[PDB]
Every structure is written in C-alpha cells, then in structure tokens.
Design a protein around this motif. Sequence first.
Motif, PDB file in Angstrom:
ATOM      1  N   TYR A  27      25.970  41.811  37.930  1.00 49.33           N
ATOM      2  CA  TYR A  27      24.822  40.708  38.129  1.00 49.33           C
ATOM      3  C   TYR A  27      23.423  40.919  37.479  1.00 49.33           C
ATOM      4  O   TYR A  27      22.955  40.049  36.891  1.00 49.33           O
ATOM      5  CB  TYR A  27      24.442  40.655  39.573  1.00 49.33           C
ATOM      6  N   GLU A  28      23.157  42.267  37.194  1.00 46.26           N
ATOM      7  CA  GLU A  28      21.873  42.391  36.292  1.00 46.26           C
ATOM      8  C   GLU A  28      21.977  41.995  35.126  1.00 46.26           C
ATOM      9  O   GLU A  28      21.072  41.220  34.488  1.00 46.26           O
ATOM     10  CB  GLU A  28      21.522  44.141  36.530  1.00 46.26           C
ATOM     11  N   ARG A  29      23.395  42.214  34.613  1.00 44.17           N
ATOM     12  CA  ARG A  29      23.521  41.950  33.190  1.00 44.17           C
ATOM     13  C   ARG A  29      23.332  40.414  33.107  1.00 44.17           C
ATOM     14  O   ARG A  29      22.934  39.646  31.896  1.00 44.17           O
ATOM     15  CB  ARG A  29      24.966  42.412  32.874  1.00 44.17           C
ATOM     16  N   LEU A  30      23.883  39.657  33.998  1.00 42.48           N
ATOM     17  CA  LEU A  30      23.858  37.995  33.870  1.00 42.48           C
ATOM     18  C   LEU A  30      22.456  37.534  33.883  1.00 42.48           C
ATOM     19  O   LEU A  30      22.117  36.901  33.257  1.00 42.48           O
ATOM     20  CB  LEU A  30      24.562  37.507  35.091  1.00 42.48           C
ATOM     21  N   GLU A  31      21.443  38.469  34.321  1.00 40.43           N
ATOM     22  CA  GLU A  31      20.112  37.952  34.582  1.00 40.43           C
ATOM     23  C   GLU A  31      19.615  38.108  33.166  1.00 40.43           C
ATOM     24  O   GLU A  31      18.978  37.199  32.562  1.00 40.43           O
ATOM     25  CB  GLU A  31      19.235  38.876  35.475  1.00 40.43           C
ATOM     26  N   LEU A  32      20.045  39.119  32.417  1.00 43.22           N
ATOM     27  CA  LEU A  32      19.653  39.239  30.956  1.00 43.22           C
ATOM     28  C   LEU A  32      20.368  38.148  30.202  1.00 43.22           C
ATOM     29  O   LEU A  32      19.493  37.383  29.350  1.00 43.22           O
ATOM     30  CB  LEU A  32      20.304  40.421  30.444  1.00 43.22           C
ATOM     31  N   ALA A  33      21.568  37.827  30.177  1.00 48.32           N
ATOM     32  CA  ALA A  33      22.160  36.605  29.839  1.00 48.32           C
ATOM     33  C   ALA A  33      21.495  35.154  30.179  1.00 48.32           C
ATOM     34  O   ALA A  33      21.233  34.254  29.726  1.00 48.32           O
ATOM     35  CB  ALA A  33      23.601  36.416  30.012  1.00 48.32           C
ATOM     36  N   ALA A  34      21.227  34.974  31.600  1.00 47.14           N
ATOM     37  CA  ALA A  34      20.430  33.841  32.155  1.00 47.14           C
ATOM     38  C   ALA A  34      19.173  33.806  31.295  1.00 47.14           C
ATOM     39  O   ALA A  34      18.733  32.538  31.143  1.00 47.14           O
ATOM     40  CB  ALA A  34      20.288  34.053  33.532  1.00 47.14           C
ATOM     41  N   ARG A  35      18.537  34.669  30.884  1.00 49.01           N
ATOM     42  CA  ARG A  35      17.122  34.637  30.254  1.00 49.01           C
ATOM     43  C   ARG A  35      17.366  34.055  28.864  1.00 49.01           C
ATOM     44  O   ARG A  35      16.737  33.405  28.447  1.00 49.01           O
ATOM     45  CB  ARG A  35      16.708  36.157  30.299  1.00 49.01           C
ATOM     46  N   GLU A  36      18.340  34.646  28.225  1.00 49.15           N
ATOM     47  CA  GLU A  36      18.812  33.935  26.986  1.00 49.15           C
ATOM     48  C   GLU A  36      18.937  32.555  26.803  1.00 49.15           C
ATOM     49  O   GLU A  36      18.516  31.824  26.072  1.00 49.15           O
ATOM     50  CB  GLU A  36      19.848  34.844  26.135  1.00 49.15           C
ATOM     51  N   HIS A  37      19.697  32.156  27.861  1.00 46.10           N
ATOM     52  CA  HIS A  37      20.306  30.654  27.774  1.00 46.10           C
ATOM     53  C   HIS A  37      19.364  29.990  28.850  1.00 46.10           C
ATOM     54  O   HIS A  37      19.352  28.759  28.887  1.00 46.10           O
ATOM     55  CB  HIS A  37      21.702  30.733  28.593  1.00 46.10           C
ATOM     56  N   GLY A  38      18.313  30.678  29.461  1.00 46.07           N
ATOM     57  CA  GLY A  38      17.502  30.064  30.464  1.00 46.07           C
ATOM     58  C   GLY A  38      18.313  29.490  31.763  1.00 46.07           C
ATOM     59  O   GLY A  38      17.946  28.397  32.325  1.00 46.07           O
ATOM     60  N   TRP A  39      19.576  30.102  31.985  1.00 47.88           N
ATOM     61  CA  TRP A  39      20.083  29.658  33.100  1.00 47.88           C
ATOM     62  C   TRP A  39      19.435  29.749  34.551  1.00 47.88           C
ATOM     63  O   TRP A  39      19.069  30.904  34.679  1.00 47.88           O
ATOM     64  CB  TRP A  39      21.511  30.411  33.168  1.00 47.88           C
ATOM     65  N   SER A  40      19.625  29.046  35.373  1.00 49.33           N
ATOM     66  CA  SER A  40      18.984  29.412  36.795  1.00 49.33           C
ATOM     67  C   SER A  40      20.146  29.881  37.582  1.00 49.33           C
ATOM     68  O   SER A  40      21.027  29.246  37.941  1.00 49.33           O
ATOM     69  CB  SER A  40      18.483  28.153  37.256  1.00 49.33           C
ATOM     70  N   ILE A  41      19.885  31.078  37.844  1.00 50.31           N
ATOM     71  CA  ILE A  41      21.180  31.816  38.692  1.00 50.31           C
ATOM     72  C   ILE A  41      20.983  31.614  40.086  1.00 50.31           C
ATOM     73  O   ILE A  41      19.765  31.723  40.638  1.00 50.31           O
ATOM     74  CB  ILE A  41      21.347  33.090  38.321  1.00 50.31           C
ATOM     75  N   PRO A  42      21.839  31.653  41.176  1.00 51.59           N
ATOM     76  CA  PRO A  42      21.625  31.603  42.263  1.00 51.59           C
ATOM     77  C   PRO A  42      21.415  33.072  43.123  1.00 51.59           C
ATOM     78  O   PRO A  42      21.507  33.883  42.492  1.00 51.59           O
ATOM     79  CB  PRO A  42      22.889  30.929  42.930  1.00 51.59           C
ATOM     80  N   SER A  43      21.033  32.838  44.194  1.00 50.56           N
ATOM     81  CA  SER A  43      20.612  34.401  45.020  1.00 50.56           C
ATOM     82  C   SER A  43      21.996  35.327  44.967  1.00 50.56           C
ATOM     83  O   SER A  43      22.900  34.831  44.952  1.00 50.56           O
ATOM     84  CB  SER A  43      20.206  34.219  46.366  1.00 50.56           C
ATOM     85  N   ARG A  44      21.826  36.354  44.817  1.00 49.30           N
ATOM     86  CA  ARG A  44      23.020  37.441  44.531  1.00 49.30           C
ATOM     87  C   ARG A  44      23.617  37.347  45.784  1.00 49.30           C
ATOM     88  O   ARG A  44      25.096  36.969  45.621  1.00 49.30           O
ATOM     89  CB  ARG A  44      22.400  38.679  44.486  1.00 49.30           C
ATOM     90  N   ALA A  45      23.230  37.184  47.083  1.00 50.24           N
ATOM     91  CA  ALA A  45      24.141  36.993  48.187  1.00 50.24           C
ATOM     92  C   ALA A  45      24.960  35.745  47.978  1.00 50.24           C
ATOM     93  O   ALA A  45      26.251  35.995  48.473  1.00 50.24           O
ATOM     94  CB  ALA A  45      23.085  36.915  49.369  1.00 50.24           C
TER      95      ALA A  45
END
Length: 65
Positions: A27-45
Amino acid sequence: SEFDEDAWQFLIADYLRPEKPAFRKCYERLELAAREHGWSIPSRATAFRRIQQLDEAMVVACREG
C-alpha cells in the motif's frame, strides 16, 4: 467508492503476483504511484476490506502452487 480504476487495478495486480509483498508495504508503494498519476486512493481499511470480498479462492489465486 469513486477512485482511479487504474490505481485499484494496480494494487490488485500486485496482490495477485506470486511475489505477494506485505499488504502494508504494498500500500505505501501504491501511494508513491498514486502521487505520480495523482490517483485518489481510498482509506487502507477500505482497500483490504474489499480484498476480503473477492474470495478465499483469491488467496489461492496468487500462491496457486
């Protein structure tokens, strides 16, 4: 749930890999990717909860050895 299908699919693609990294680390890695694509990720839970809704067979799908 209204979020970048590209990010959700990305998380699922890594989860279905035989590598099977730790969910918290993945999940932490996805945050890095979400940042590059600017994706809005949902809460980890929320993310893990839906992984449960897939199926127990889904766990076998990755490590199907």
